[PDB]
From Swiss-Prot:
Expressing tissues: Ubiquitous.
Effect of residue 174 to A: Abolishes histone demethylase activity without affecting ability to bind H4K20me2
Gene that encodes it: KDM4A
Domain comment quoted from the record: The 2 Tudor domains recognize and bind methylated histone H3 'Lys-4' residue (H3K4me). Double Tudor domain has an interdigitated structure and the unusual fold is required for its ability to bind methylated histone tails. Trimethylated H3 'Lys-4' (H3K4me3) is bound in a cage of 3 aromatic residues, 2 of which are from the Tudor domain 2, while the binding specificity is determined by side-chain interactions involving residues from the Tudor domain 1. The Tudor domains are also able to bind trimethylated histone H3 'Lys-9' (H3K9me3), di- and trimethylated H4 'Lys-20' (H4K20me2 and H4K20me3).
Post-translational modification: Ubiquitinated by RNF8 and RNF168 following DNA damage, leading to its degradation. Degradation promotes accessibility of H4K20me2 mark for DNA repair protein TP53BP1, which is then recruited. Also ubiquitinated by the SCF(FBXO22) complex; leading to proteasomal degradation.
Binding site for 2-oxoglutarate: 125, 184, 192, 227
Residues binding Zn(2+), per UniProt: 220, 226, 292, 294
Name of the protein this chain belongs to: Lysine-specific demethylase 4A
Domain JmjN: 7-49
Subunit structure as annotated in this protein's UniProt entry: Interacts with histone deacetylase proteins HDAC1, HDAC2 and HDAC3. Interacts with RB and NCOR1. Interacts with VRK1. Interacts with FBXO22; this interaction promotes KDM4A ubiquitination.
Family: Belongs to the JHDM3 histone demethylase family.
Length: 337
């Protein structure tokens, strides 16, 4: 399933939507994981919050000014921490003449303006805010409590984060911490555009990045983990790196899969909610994740190897666990489909 590894979109009914982990297993049985990114449009009747007119007093403790340097589709993003601000203050800046979205008809025109102007007039990203916009009673796809096997770490990446975007705010090329999955919900506002590289081609993106930034690569085993590297889709086309693109709109979920490299940008004022999560398939990725060797987020895999792979525990502890990851294989939970 999904031999082209193209980004798939799913429209679950209210009944299919209710079981989060089962629905992740379902989309994997359909080959969604091969693209490294999937869109899930929830049923129309489902709302995580009745209204977003009550969040003006919400504090963004560390807004970041995003300074970008580069040319020829290759850039490095530098984050400058600014003083705390409210969502009311952030919305005022986001919609001001200095930072508002330029006029555009088609996405391709806006995508061009982004790649042409990302190094000018550095925007402010109200990123990494600990919090949720979900009402406490919401039991479906609740980013604040997904209750996947990732909870075994607790029972930081198992908590919800908010992202208040403005035009031209960006997320650099990366995989998740420990090559985990992630869920991103766009609560409201202007779209968020995504680029993705299939996990089966992730090593090709890394080789391209290493060749362009040899200083960074010598300094760290996993420099892409710093989340500072921006590469244009045109630069990827030029070097034959397979990739796909998708625009997430308000009210839609995006799912990133283990070792799924993604990057993207915000079209204007918006707010997304995200967290990391796991399935039984992730354990092997966590065991094999190449981590940052210069700073970082590290999860001990021991608890997972003991519980889900007891027969492999002595072999693994000895450093003799030679398992090769097949990126095309769905999670064992997908068996029923
Ligand atoms: C401690 N961890 C640091 C990295 C954090 C992280 C990992 N990935 N990641 C992102 N991925 C996808 C989309 C977005 C986005 O729209 N904005 C900003 N960051 C994003 C953010 C998770 C938390
Ligand atoms: Zn991510
Ligand atoms: Zn590093």
């Amino acid at each position: 399933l999904n031999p082209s590894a193209r980004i798939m979109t799913f429209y679950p009914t209210m009944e299919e939507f209710r079981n989060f982990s089962r629905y992740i297993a379902y989309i994997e049985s359909q080959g969604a994981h091969r693209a490294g990114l999937a869109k899930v449009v929830p049923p129309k009747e489902w709302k995580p919050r009745a209204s977003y007119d009550d969040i003006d007093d919400l504090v963004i403790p560390a807004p970041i000014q995003q300074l970008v340097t580069g040319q020829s589709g290759l850039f490095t993003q530098y984050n400058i921490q600014k003083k705390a601000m409210t969502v009311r203050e952030f919305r005022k800046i986001a919609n001001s003449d200095k930072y508002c979205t330029p006029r555009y008809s088609e996405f391709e025109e806006l995508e061009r303006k982004y790649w042409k102007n990302l190094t000018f007039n550095p925007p402010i990203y109200g990123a990494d805010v600990n919090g949720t916009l979900y009402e406490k009673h919401v039991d479906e796809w609740n980013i604040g409590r997904l209750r996947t096997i990732l909870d075994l770490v607790e029972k930081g990446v198992n908590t919800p984060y908010l992202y208040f975007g403005m035009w031209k705010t960006s997320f650099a090329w990366h995989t998740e911490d420990m090559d985990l999955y992630s869920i991103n919900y766009l609560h409201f506002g202007e779209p968020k555009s995504w680029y993705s590289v299939p996990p089966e081609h992730g090593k090709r993106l890394e080789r391209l990045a290493k060749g362009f930034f040899p200083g960074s690569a010598q300094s760290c085993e996993a420099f892409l983990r710093h989340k500072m590297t921006l590469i244009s889709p045109l630069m990827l086309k030029k070097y034959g790196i397979p990739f796909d693109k998708v625009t997430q709109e308000a009210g839609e979920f995006m799912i990133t899969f283990p070792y799924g490299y993604h990057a993207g940008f915000n079209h204007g004022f918006n707010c997304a909610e995200s967290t990391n999560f796991a399935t039984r398939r992730w354990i092997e990725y966590g065991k094999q994740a190449v981590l940052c060797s210069c700073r970082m987020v590290k999860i001990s895999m021991d608890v997972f190897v003991r519980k889900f792979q007891p027969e492999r525990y002595k072999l693994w502890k000895a450093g003799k666990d030679n398992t090769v990851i097949d990126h095309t294989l769905p999670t064992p939970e997908a068996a029923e489909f």
